[PDB]
Motif scaffolding. Structure first.
Motif, PDB file in Angstrom:
ATOM      1  N   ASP A  86     -59.723  20.827  39.727  1.00  0.00           N
ATOM      2  CA  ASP A  86     -60.189  19.632  39.726  1.00  0.00           C
ATOM      3  C   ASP A  86     -59.275  18.431  40.128  1.00  0.00           C
ATOM      4  O   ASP A  86     -59.478  17.269  40.373  1.00  0.00           O
ATOM      5  CB  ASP A  86     -61.050  19.300  38.583  1.00  0.00           C
ATOM      6  N   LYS A  87     -58.173  18.634  39.818  1.00  0.00           N
ATOM      7  CA  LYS A  87     -56.810  17.890  39.953  1.00  0.00           C
ATOM      8  C   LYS A  87     -56.639  17.491  41.242  1.00  0.00           C
ATOM      9  O   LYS A  87     -55.936  16.525  41.917  1.00  0.00           O
ATOM     10  CB  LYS A  87     -55.509  18.430  39.600  1.00  0.00           C
ATOM     11  N   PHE A  88     -57.481  18.160  42.350  1.00  0.00           N
ATOM     12  CA  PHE A  88     -57.229  17.960  43.894  1.00  0.00           C
ATOM     13  C   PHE A  88     -58.310  17.237  44.589  1.00  0.00           C
ATOM     14  O   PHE A  88     -59.437  17.996  44.468  1.00  0.00           O
ATOM     15  CB  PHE A  88     -56.715  19.298  44.545  1.00  0.00           C
ATOM     16  N   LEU A  94     -54.270  20.327  47.459  1.00  0.00           N
ATOM     17  CA  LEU A  94     -54.093  21.654  46.574  1.00  0.00           C
ATOM     18  C   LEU A  94     -52.893  22.651  47.265  1.00  0.00           C
ATOM     19  O   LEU A  94     -52.444  23.049  46.342  1.00  0.00           O
ATOM     20  CB  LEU A  94     -55.567  22.397  46.952  1.00  0.00           C
ATOM     21  N   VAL A  95     -53.057  22.682  48.400  1.00  0.00           N
ATOM     22  CA  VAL A  95     -52.101  23.558  49.129  1.00  0.00           C
ATOM     23  C   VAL A  95     -50.581  22.930  49.003  1.00  0.00           C
ATOM     24  O   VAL A  95     -49.655  23.790  48.627  1.00  0.00           O
ATOM     25  CB  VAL A  95     -52.168  23.766  50.888  1.00  0.00           C
ATOM     26  N   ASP A 100     -45.889  22.894  42.918  1.00  0.00           N
ATOM     27  CA  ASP A 100     -45.678  21.791  41.858  1.00  0.00           C
ATOM     28  C   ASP A 100     -46.853  22.120  40.593  1.00  0.00           C
ATOM     29  O   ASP A 100     -46.557  22.368  39.417  1.00  0.00           O
ATOM     30  CB  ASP A 100     -45.603  20.272  42.474  1.00  0.00           C
ATOM     31  N   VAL A 101     -47.708  21.845  41.010  1.00  0.00           N
ATOM     32  CA  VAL A 101     -49.089  21.641  40.132  1.00  0.00           C
ATOM     33  C   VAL A 101     -49.593  23.011  39.689  1.00  0.00           C
ATOM     34  O   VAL A 101     -49.499  23.177  38.318  1.00  0.00           O
ATOM     35  CB  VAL A 101     -50.265  20.739  40.664  1.00  0.00           C
ATOM     36  N   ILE A 102     -49.988  23.773  40.428  1.00  0.00           N
ATOM     37  CA  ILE A 102     -50.724  25.173  40.067  1.00  0.00           C
ATOM     38  C   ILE A 102     -49.421  25.904  39.380  1.00  0.00           C
ATOM     39  O   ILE A 102     -49.788  26.455  38.290  1.00  0.00           O
ATOM     40  CB  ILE A 102     -50.884  25.924  41.436  1.00  0.00           C
ATOM     41  N   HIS A 103     -48.476  26.073  39.978  1.00  0.00           N
ATOM     42  CA  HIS A 103     -47.172  26.757  39.376  1.00  0.00           C
ATOM     43  C   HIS A 103     -46.935  26.418  37.614  1.00  0.00           C
ATOM     44  O   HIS A 103     -47.006  26.973  36.676  1.00  0.00           O
ATOM     45  CB  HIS A 103     -45.945  26.580  40.033  1.00  0.00           C
TER      46      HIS A 103
END
Ligand code: HEM
Ligand code: ZN
Length: 180
Positions: A86-88, A94-95, A100-103
């Protein structure tokens, strides 16, 4: 390999082949009384052995099965970690946010996860250059996940995968072109 990956694989296998097939695969390829706990780490060989069996049964390249799983896997991850996705607002965000974010969010939610090395560059022609590196050599799962993410955002994409570890390179290069 975290149990969540196995859990989504179970959803796919069971839905496509039935529970008896899944349990057969576990008898063949996992220790006795194996149960995949989402948060726990398991030998990646168990995952590969299972998927290898499926691929050989269907007489397909293993990498095509892995790519199919990858696409299935995005929704599996998105469903279990909705706050993260939902952050994207869009596919490109997202990609470019995998590194940064997913990791970060995965390392916050999991104990000692084994994530691939993924780095993205947004090019001036609005193509995305995504570098992939991992001991797991799951670039086809990455490709699948990207298509899964594209579906999620209703975005059509094309992927060029012209550098690949499976041919001896020390990394893969996935060029993503967004289309209409
Ligand atoms: C296009 C988007 C994504 C790509 C390309 C991607 C890539 C990958 C790949 C290829 C793997 C397999 C492991 C490896 O290659 O070494 C992996 C593992 C994993 N990914 Fe992602 N991923 C994406 C999105 C997400 C999202 C949205 C989440 C949400 C939490 C997530 C969480 C995880 C987790 C928990 C693992 C397992 C780590 C482990 O087994 O220790 N990924 N990712
Ligand atoms: Zn590759």
């Amino acid at each position: 390999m975290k149990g969540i990956i196995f859990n989504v694989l179970e959803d796919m296998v069971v839905a496509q082949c039935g529970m008896s097939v899944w349990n057969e695969l576990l008898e063949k390829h996992a220790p006795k009384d194996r149960v995949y706990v989402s948060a726990k780490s398991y030998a990646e060989s168990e995952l590969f052995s299972i998927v290898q069996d499926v691929a050989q049964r269907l007489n397909m390249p293993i990498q095509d099965v892995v790519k199919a799983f990858g696409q299935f896997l995005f929704n599996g991850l998105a469903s279990r970690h909705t706050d993260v996705v939902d952050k994207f607002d869009d596919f490109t965000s997202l990609v470019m946010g995998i590194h940064d974010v997913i990791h970060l969010e995965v390392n916050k939610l999991y104990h000692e996860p084994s994530l691939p090395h993924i780095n993205g560059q947004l090019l001036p022609n609005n193509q995305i250059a995504l570098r992939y590196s991992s001991p797991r050599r799951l670039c086809f799962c990455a490709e699948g996940l990207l298509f899964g993410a594209a579906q999620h955002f209703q975005q059509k994409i094309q992927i060029s995968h012209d550098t690949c570890m499976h041919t001896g390179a020390d990394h893969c290069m996935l060029i993503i072109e967004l289309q209409n």
